[PDB]
């Protein structure tokens, strides 16, 4: 009913603001779109669950995230995919470490602001 879609909408607004901060922090847009298989032909032979921020925006517009944890899973999937494919000497691996640091600095307050919608 109205009250349930209102709740889902206010929760999506909190997840969106967090995704936009992650997209903004990713200035080189390393994680904005799926990794280009024409540039990296062996990528999907190594990464079994590719993830990127644009896919997360689509899940959001479809109201696919029903808990904070489901959102976090996708952020940490992007990060752990980057560690799995790339060597630790590369700019990609360093940028994943940087966004993991940024995310870990934010998530406690955003996660609380999310639970507080249905308080």
């Amino acid at each position: 009913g109205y009250d349930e879609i209102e709740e889902l909408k206010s929760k999506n607004e909190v997840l969106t603001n967090l995704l936009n901060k992650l997209i903004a922090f990713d200035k080189k847009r390393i994680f904005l779109y799926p990794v280009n298989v024409q540039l990296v032909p062996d990528y999907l032979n190594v990464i079994k669950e590719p993830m990127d921020f644009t896919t997360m925006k689509q899940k959001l517009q479809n109201f696919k995230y029903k808990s904070f944890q489901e959102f976090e899973k996708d952020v940490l999937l992007i990060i752990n995919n980057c560690y799995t494919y790339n060597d630790p000497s590369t700019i990609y691996y360093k940028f994943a470490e940087d966004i993991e640091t940024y995310y870990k600095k934010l998530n406690i307050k955003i996660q609380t602001k999310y639970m507080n919608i249905h308080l």
């Binding site: 540039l39 062996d42 190594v46 494919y85 790339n86 990609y92």
Partner: peptide, 5 residues
């Protein structure tokens, strides 16, 4: 992985 750059 092979590598990107």
């Amino acid at each position: 992985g092979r590598g990107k750059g």
